[PDB]
Design a binder for these strands. Structure first.
Ligand SMILES: [K+]
Length: 191
RNA sequence: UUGAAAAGCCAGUGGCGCGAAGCUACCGUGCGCUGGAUUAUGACUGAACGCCUCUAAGUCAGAAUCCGGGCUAGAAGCGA
């Protein structure tokens, strides 16, 4: 029914710099740089500075927006929160190898930017996966048959994990019985 | 049949054997191709709906599929 004003605000930690211009959000922190293009959202983004204190707030609002349009405000705020988390703490995904008979042989290429899977269900084919930008994959030493993906972009890290998982799908078998694969087991922050 | 020999000719290709050349047969030989976008499907982050959610915004992989490329032709189209 076109609610007049739907607004939501988020606090910004003092250790992160943020710039907004034409719905282009630039985030800077100790771990590096992140960028997002929110041009596809018909929302108004504003950065409020507290002169007396010096703190930062990001306010996103929609005017005369329907429910569908208003649903994007929280999405944008969560995306900005994820950017801040990635630039301050970073993102770490953990994957575990699951197999019944054939151990999965994983080889990490140079730079921790590519992975080779060789013995999935005793298959002679070699599966190649390349990590996305800013995401590095390593083989854990404290946990058996575990892969650690570290990055600054939650979306890129999760997409790399999804690529690894989907590259090892079982076919022509009852997947309920043949549970072999590589699956995401934990999501968290590097620090 | 030309007197004979030799050498020819007629029987509309006289008949038979071999027969080069050309043509020709899976009856012989050579060759027949790879970038993008996507369907179904499976997923990422993510609200709506403080949780959840492949979906609402955004995003990924994806086919004897489509498009392009390659091959054939080359327009009251054109260049040096
Ligand atoms: K989800």
């Amino acid at each position: 029914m076109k609610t007049i004003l739907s607004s939501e605000t988020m606090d910004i930690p003092d250790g992160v710099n943020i710039k907004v211009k034409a719905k282009q959000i630039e985030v800077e922190g100790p771990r590096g740089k992140l960028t997002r293009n929110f041009k596809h959202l018909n929302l108004d983004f504003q950065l409020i500075k507290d002169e007396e204190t010096g703190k930062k707030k990001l306010k996103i609002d929609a005017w005369f927006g329907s429910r569908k349009t208003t649903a994007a405000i929280r999405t944008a705020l969560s995306h900005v929160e994820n950017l801040i988390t990635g630039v301050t703490k970073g993102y770490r995904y953990k994957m575990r190898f699951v197999y019944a008979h054939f151990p999965i042989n994983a080889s990490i290429s140079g730079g921790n930017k590519a992975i080779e899977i060789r013995n999935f269900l005793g298959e002679k084919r070699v599966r190649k996966v390349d990590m996305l930008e800013g995401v590095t994959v390593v083989r854990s030493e404290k946990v058996k048959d575990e892969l650690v993906l570290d990055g600054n972009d939650i979306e890129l890290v999760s997409r790399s994990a999804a690529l690894i998982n989907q590259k090892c799908h079982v076919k022509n078998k009852d997947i309920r019985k043949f549970l072999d694969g590589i699956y995401v087991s934990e999501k968290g922050r590097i620090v």
